[PDB]
Structure 1
């Protein structure tokens, strides 16, 4: 180990993936090995997720005195006057053109900012994700955020998560979504079909078409293009339902579920976060990096490395 100068002995590495653990920010630190058994989720929630393809948590997982700090980090990550430091360590951001737009997103941001690094290891969601994945180990894949603009905030059409995850051999994932602010059907709350995860025996629906200028209603009524008569009858049986979220509520989804999110009609912005987990027994498909500037794997190599740290391990 080389000699570190006297006034540099407390700093941190450029990429926060190296600190094998959670910083002492936000919540104190990880609980002891025995103290991990209080975050468990009631089985009824598990059956509800199995049936409807999504489920909400009974209690919020964050407090306002932490959500305000997270929103401060999110606002800082969007500066177009002084670009946020550690920008080059992100997977991809909408500000790569130095102009941005009415939508702001960043992926793999836990490698760039404090606090949000500590969010990954929050027990109250990691243990729930472990329970959803049949009581096994969990692994972070990549985290991203969304911030809509003011009353001209665009929407996101219907989508299936696995449509972006062809590189994974099995369908063994889960997604946790955090609402950083109060959300509503007039502000950008999500709407998802309560049975789209049990269609075509797990098949993947054809990709949807969209136009970058039409109104939100037209982008919402393009679902009929994909479905057939059989799926149409279930659509009549199971109409789409929108869920409203307050500050700090969490929603668990399934990778095969159709989902979309309305636009922004309020007077300001709105923020939300998406975290995607794996279980064990997960292998790549092709030879190459799953994400830009990540570790390369073999055609049938198990997925593991520094960029995909373990979070929670039962027993």
Structure 2
């Protein structure tokens, strides 16, 4: 077609169509023979496979990049001048146009710069490939959480794969990145060590969510979904909260029991979840996996513009 002279430098309507990654945060991706620098130690992989989660030794982003990424989150929940490309999100907490004390966004990698760049970050993608038995890494989807000051709620105990039942094999990993300093008083993760090998790699029954109640009861709902032996290993190794810095990341298994604390600080707290999947991932039904996405059929290999390949060890 003819792109007008003042529209030649524009970008696609949704950043899904942007093949590759823009150079905004860390420039361009390294060369094919330059991907060996971001490899992680085998002890980190062993710790992930033993505990069900692991904290990467080094922060993944510089402070200026974290500031820019937090500005993207701050502008993704404007509620006055709503974000451009808001329709390019799988879900939003502001669909009601009011929001609340908790802001959650999904599929923001198609809406803002930096967030689209964060998907192709080598530091986390190489580690995800190593976790996934050195295979192709494909984005599953994104998620952004923002809890307000003095009133932010807490997300109770949950299993990630319990929301991904339409994907056949368990071949997933979660990377959670703290865009702000976190603690037990503001959005720190609370994971159960060794909880990904409890029900023979199965899924625990969903927890009962009763809002408008204190955080202690919300975090104490664990004793209602476990059985006697799981009670014993919970007695032996109680849930542990991980303190995260301004850029530190955390790898989480899909089957690991996981919750987030509430926000009692004087400022909002932000975090970003990115879900990755391997090459050998299939669907179970006929239809789309996400709202307004490419539809697959039967046991169809999950691929397309909505699930880009972010790393290839070949």
Query: TM class by shorter-chain length?
Result: over 0.9
Quote the offset at 1:80 in angstroms: 1.1
Q: What do the CA deviations read for 1:19-67 (whole angstroms, capped 9, x no partner)?
A: 1011110101100000001100000000000100000001000011110
Quote the offset at 1:5 in angstroms: 1.3
For residue 131 of structure 1, give the secondary structure of its aligned residue in structure 2.
helix
* TM-score, length basis structure 2: 0.99
Distance, in Å, in 1 between the alignment partners of 2:307 and 2:49 is 26
Distance, in Å, in 2 between the alignment partners of 1:153 and 1:245 is 18
For residue 135 of structure 1, give the secondary structure of its aligned residue in structure 2.
coil
Distance, in Å, in 2 between the alignment partners of 1:85 and 1:23 is 18
Quote the offset at 1:115 in angstroms: 1.2
Quote the offset at 1:268 in angstroms: 1.0
More deviation, 124-133/232-241: 232-241
Distance, in Å, in 2 between the alignment partners of 1:149 and 1:175 is 24
Quote the offset at 1:188 in angstroms: 1.2
- Listed as ranges, the gaps of 5+ residues in structure 2 are none
For residue 202 of structure 1, give the secondary structure of its aligned residue in structure 2.
coil
Distance, in Å, in 2 between the alignment partners of 1:136 and 1:88 is 32
Q: Which residue of 1 aligns with 2:200?
A: 201
Q: Which residue of 2 aligns with 1:235?
A: 234
Quote the offset at 1:145 in angstroms: 0.4
Quote the offset at 1:238 in angstroms: 1.2
Moved over 6 A (4+): none
Distance, in Å, in 1 between the alignment partners of 2:202 and 2:43 is 27
Distance, in Å, in 1 between the alignment partners of 2:48 and 2:84 is 39
Q: What do the CA deviations read for 1:178-233 (whole angstroms, capped 9, x no partner)?
A: 00010000111010100111102111111100211110000111111111111111
* TM-score, length basis structure 1: 0.99
- Listed as ranges, the gaps of 5+ residues in structure 1 are none
Q: What do the CA deviations read for 1:2-21 (whole angstroms, capped 9, x no partner)?
A: 11211111111101111101
Distance, in Å, in 1 between the alignment partners of 2:3 and 2:132 is 44
After superposition, the CA RMSD in angstroms is 0.6
For residue 51 of structure 1, give the secondary structure of its aligned residue in structure 2.
helix
Distance, in Å, in 1 between the alignment partners of 2:195 and 2:164 is 17
Quote the offset at 1:310 in angstroms: 0.4
Distance, in Å, in 1 between the alignment partners of 2:187 and 2:18 is 35
Distance, in Å, in 1 between the alignment partners of 2:32 and 2:238 is 43
Q: Which residue of 2 aligns with 1:163?
A: 162
Distance, in Å, in 2 between the alignment partners of 1:292 and 1:228 is 36
